[PDB]
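Worked example 4.2. Below are the chains of a multi-component assembly; read each line carefully before continuing.
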Amino acid sequence: SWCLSVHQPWASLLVRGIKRVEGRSWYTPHRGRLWIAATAKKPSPQEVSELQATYRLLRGKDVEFPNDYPSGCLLGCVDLIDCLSQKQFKEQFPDISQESDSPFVFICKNPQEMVVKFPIKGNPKIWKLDSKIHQGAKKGLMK
Amino acid sequence: SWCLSVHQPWASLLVRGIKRVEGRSWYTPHRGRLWIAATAKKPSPQEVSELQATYRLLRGKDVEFPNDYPSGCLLGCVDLIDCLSQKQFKEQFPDISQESDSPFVFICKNPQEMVVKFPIKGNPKIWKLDSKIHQGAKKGLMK
DNA sequence: ATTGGATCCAAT
DNA sequence: ATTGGATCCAAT
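Applying the procedure described above to all four chains together yields the following structure tokens:
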């Protein structure tokens, strides 16, 4: 099983479905389930408030944000349906293409958030989950 | 007795007489003996080499530099003969006025270097020497 | 100044 | 990513 580390608060917005794409400077052929881990970098409470304000405008004034954006832990997963270039992204998702300017744009569907979030240390790019933590995360989803 | 903290390598150049003035953003009415302490900031060996190259050009190809520029210690003293404004400095010392652009310029004479340099922790601006270290420094000069 | 918490930086 | 050495920053 494969994982991507993402800075908070974006990491929790991805597993909640509020943020629908993730931009990177590199391509991956990976498709299917992609676990999402928060990096260790803690966001300032104003950074959280400004991002929350922006996503209310993009999604609707009553979007339900997570109460906490925990760092350094495994949060849940998405289905990585495509890794588009910025050109393909503008072509295929005109309504949200403004939401990432990155060279490659990861299209995420079916987000799932873990109720119990396990501590983890991440790596660059797409990296392989340890079996013991992946086993626990799979059993946490099926509850 | 009063002391001024100066970054190396300039601090040792002052007690050797190679550097003849010290520039600051503030004025002092202090005149007479002024002890010179090196700050704790260690200079890079290239910073020392570049400064040494400059002072050879200003003073003569055979100027004798100290072999070491020790940090965080009491180095010796000068006689502070005047604290000139930058305007007075240009008027009175035209041959060396290029050697400081500071708002106030401390004119130093009679430099004396201690053979044994005692560890010290400095302060901003002109500060009062502890009696025990000042007693030892005075006895070190008279040897 | 000195100090150490905050931030920057590079690992090969 | 994470890590910690290097550098920046502010103390009232």
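Take a moment to check your reading of the output against the notes. Chain A has one domain: 2-141. The helical segments of chain A are 10-16, 45-59, 86-92, 131-141.
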